Structure 1
Amino acid sequence: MAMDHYLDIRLRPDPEFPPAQLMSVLFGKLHQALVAQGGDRIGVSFPDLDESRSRLGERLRIHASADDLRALLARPWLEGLRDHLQFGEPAVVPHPTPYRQVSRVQAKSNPERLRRRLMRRHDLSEEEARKRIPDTVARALDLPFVTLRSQSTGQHFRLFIRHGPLQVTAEEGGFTCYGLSKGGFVPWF
């Protein structure tokens, strides 16, 4: 509903990295060279998203502000690797604005982190917390929640997103220092 300043990002297909790898590289570059000095308005929804085939990211769409894009796209934390993807263009916000509140948050993924929490500041049974981790115990994003991770943990990327309901309503909220929404986002369409 409030996707006035709109932009897109298309990572071109090449044999030097996967589409999820290119999306993770673009997301890490945006999180390092967009919320480096801070900021308020950052909206990064799936501009070419399809959450039915289990693919969380294969296209980028930015719904940000005017001054947030006039000074948030001219740094070396964004440029440099522009030989795979391309630049963007500005577009106005139409009357059709679905309230797709896109966020940048986490989800429950610890199958033994409850035991660490009980040992640190809980005083709970750590053996039952370790043995209480079945396949039907973890409840994370089973839809395409693309987790662009780093080279610190061997475990693969689970869900890290705050998606909203796509309808004909309006829902906007406060953007964080990483390109998300803390109660809503800009439009998507």
Structure 2
Amino acid sequence: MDHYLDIRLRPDPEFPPAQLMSVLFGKLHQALVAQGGDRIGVSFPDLDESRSRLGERLRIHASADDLRALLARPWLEGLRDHLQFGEPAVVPHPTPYRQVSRVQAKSNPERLRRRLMRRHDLSEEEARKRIPDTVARTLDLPFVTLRSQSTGQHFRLFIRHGPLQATAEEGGFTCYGLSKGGFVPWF
């Protein structure tokens, strides 16, 4: 997009920084479900793909008015002493483009068992012989553990950063703000 914001996390020993980035991601998700919009992207410039880590700095991508609407809401309350802020900057030129994606797999196939028996109404031995437990895929993507408001559960949502492109075209971002066609400047 045209403008970006990097907020830096405060060094916190008594809470490990994965939990702070978890609650920051949850704050961003409830902010996007509170305000809406389809052209709001996320980027994390400090990706270490070798250790599958996201880093210390995160970057939102929106217009100027959406940025100063985001800084003018009480979602910043309670944690101003828990991170540092940024400034509405112009994107440098040139910058390459990439993705952000939540990749889930059939990590333990009991959900596939219950869906297949809610659909087929067959025997449990048929679900045992049809698909084995070897369909469990393993992922080397960075993940973030989020809770819920209605159906409360800790789940790791993986982060896949796509390949390095050169030109950004039309595309949207979902209610989780990940790339569903919309590209973000990597710099």
Task: Note whether the superposition's TM-score is higher than 0.5.
Answer: yes
CA distance in 2 between counterparts of 1:162 and 1:134 reads: 26
Contact conserved, 1:11 with 1:59, CA < 8 A, in 2?
yes
> Percent of pairs identical after alignment?
99
TM-score (normalizing by structure 1): 0.80
Q: Specify which structure has the higher proportion of helix.
A: 2
CA distance in 2 between counterparts of 1:104 and 1:134 reads: 24
User: Residues 29, 155 of structure 1: CA spacing in aligned structure 2 closer, same or farther, 3 A cutoff?
Assistant: closer
1:79-113 deviation digits (Å, cap 9, x = unpaired) = 32121112221211222221212245644434211
Q: Specify which structure has the higher proportion of strand.
A: 2
1:14-61 deviation digits (Å, cap 9, x = unpaired) = 123111111001111111123313223221121322222122343211
State the number of aligned residues: 187
CA distance in 2 between counterparts of 1:159 and 1:130 reads: 27
Task: Tell me by how many angstroms 1:158 deviates.
Answer: 3.1
TM-score (normalizing by structure 2): 0.81
Task: Tell me by how many angstroms 1:4 deviates.
Answer: 2.0
CA distance in 2 between counterparts of 1:158 and 1:140 reads: 13
Q: Which secondary structure state, in structure 2, belongs to the residue aligned with residue 136 of structure 1?
A: helix
CA distance in 1 between counterparts of 2:121 and 2:61 reads: 45
Q: Which secondary structure state, in structure 1, belongs to the residue aligned with residue 89 of structure 2?
A: coil
Q: CA RMSD in A?
A: 3.0
User: Residues 138, 57 of structure 1: CA spacing in aligned structure 2 closer, same or farther, 3 A cutoff?
Assistant: farther
User: Residues 136, 154 of structure 1: CA spacing in aligned structure 2 closer, same or farther, 3 A cutoff?
Assistant: farther
Residues 118-129 of structure 1: pairs in structure 2 closer than 5 A: 118-129=116-127
